[PDB]
Structure formats: C-alpha cells, structure tokens
C-alpha cells in the first residue's frame, strides 16, 4: 500500500525527510516570517482590558473557532503525510482525534515570543492575561509554559515538520485496527527525524524534547475545562461551537 509500511533504505529515508518537510511547509496556517515580523505589534493595555471584559462564553466561542482553524491545517498536513492516506479510515480518524490538538500545541511555539511571553492572537501579540475571561487560568498558564519550553529548543521549521509528523503517527493510540502498519510508518518517520538531526548536528535536542505524557496531560486538561464550560453554557456549545471542534473534543 505504501513503501513506508515496510523497511526503508537510507535513500528512501532521505526522500521521507524531504516529503515531510514539504507537507509541513504547504500546510502552515501562519508563516514563520510573518510571525517574527509581527513581534513588535503588541496589544495595548486598553486592548487587553477589552478582551478581559468579554463574556466567558464570547471568549470560549472565539478561541474554539481559532483552534478549529488551526486543526483544519493539521488535517491537511496529515492528508499529505506519506502513508497516512493509505491507512484505513478508522485509523486516520483515531490518529487525528488523538493527535490533532497535540500537533497544534507544538505548532503554537512558533507563534509564541519567549522574549516577552506573548502569543500571536487575532493579529497582535498578547500575554496570557488576554485569556483571563475563559476562566481556565491553570490550563492557559500550562500551555504558555509548554510553548516557552519548546521555544528554548530553537526549532527549525524542518525539525517542527518531522517532530509533528511523529506526534501524529503514533502506533500506541487506542483504537488502531492496523497497528502493525502504523508501527512501521512510525519507525520510518522516527528514522527520518533522527537522520535529519544527525545530519544537522542537532541530536542534542532529543533528550530535551517534552516527556512522554506531557502533551497528553495538556489535551486531557483542555477536554476537562471544555466539559466545565459546557455544563455552564450548554446551548453556546450546541449552537455556536464549530462542528469539527465538537467531533474532536465532545464526541460530536
């Protein structure tokens, strides 16, 4: 079904590095050059106050829409990833349901300015205080800390491409029917990532990558906070949250 479902040669691994990097470059929601250029564009005290005065429901709605927009780009990244479209539909959905948010959390570090602890949001950079109306301070703080930690690694765009391919192609996700096929694709993407690091003298980052369970903890906290919000504003979720967001995080 795909070359990468079996043992790949060095030259095939080299091709895989190029294919993954190309898939990522074509499916960025935000260009790195744009994010870096916009760093001087920061929300004023007045603008921050405006976001803080928004109702909890209006802020949750906006943030769910922005997350859904990011997730759509991750779905396109998946579709372009060597071997992904050759997996069965059940496995494609299992991997995206479990991994789409994890990939967005990783992609976020590009939009995060470690210099002043701000993130690009609705056209300007703002600190975590911009999100205070959500009423999930702990989760926002944890996501900022995560982006801060990833920012300290100074990832290149190619490293992000290969690392996020692996975040998505995880053979341990519960529910995978063709687990052996996913294990082999994961093995080849792992080789592609480690080969690129070896070639660029960046193998030192391997021991510095987030631990096993860190991305899972942030994803579980998101679902928990959404369930709290849903109990408070059930019709906001039913009437005004994006259908894709609900399919991923509230079981439809």
């Amino acid at each position: 079904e795909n070359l990468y479902f079996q043992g790949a040669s060095l030259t095939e691994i080299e091709h895989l590095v190029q294919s993954v990097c190309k898939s990522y470059r074509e499916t960025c929601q935000l260009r790195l050059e744009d994010l870096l250029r916009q760093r001087s564009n920061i929300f004023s005290r007045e603008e921050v106050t405006g976001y803080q005065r928004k109702s909890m429901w209006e802020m949750w709605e906006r943030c769910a829409h922005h997350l859904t927009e990011a997730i759509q780009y991750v779905v396109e990244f998946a579709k372009r990833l060597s071997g992904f479209m050759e997996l069965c539909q059940n496995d494609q959905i299992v991997l995206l349901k479990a991994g789409a948010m994890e990939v967005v959390l990783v992609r976020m570090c590009r939009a995060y300015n470690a210099d002043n602890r701000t993130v690009f949001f609705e056209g300007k950079y703002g600190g975590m205080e911009l999100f205070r109306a959500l009423g999930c301070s702990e989760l926002i703080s944890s996501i900022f800390d995560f982006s801060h930690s990833l920012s300290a690694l100074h990832f290149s765009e190619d490293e992000i491409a290969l690392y996020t391919a692996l975040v998505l192609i995880n053979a341990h996700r519960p529910g995978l029917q063709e687990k052996r096929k996913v294990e082999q694709l994961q093995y080849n993407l792992e080789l592609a990532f480690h080969h690129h690091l070896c070639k660029t003298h960046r193998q030192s980052i391997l021991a510095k990558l987030p631990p096993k369970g860190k991305l899972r903890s942030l994803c579980s906290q998101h679902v928990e906070r959404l369930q709290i919000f849903q109990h408070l504003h059930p019709i906001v979720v039913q009437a005004a949250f994006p259908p894709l967001y609900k399919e991923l995080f509230s079981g439809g």
């Binding site: 959905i93 995206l96 894709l244 991923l248």
Partner: peptide
C-alpha cells in the same frame, strides 16, 4: 461527520 468529509475531499 466533518472529519470523514475532510478526509474524503480530494
């Protein structure tokens, strides 16, 4: 419903 549509949309 959505994920199936996005995956099927070529």
């Amino acid at each position: 419903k959505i994920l199936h549509r996005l995956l099927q949309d070529s």
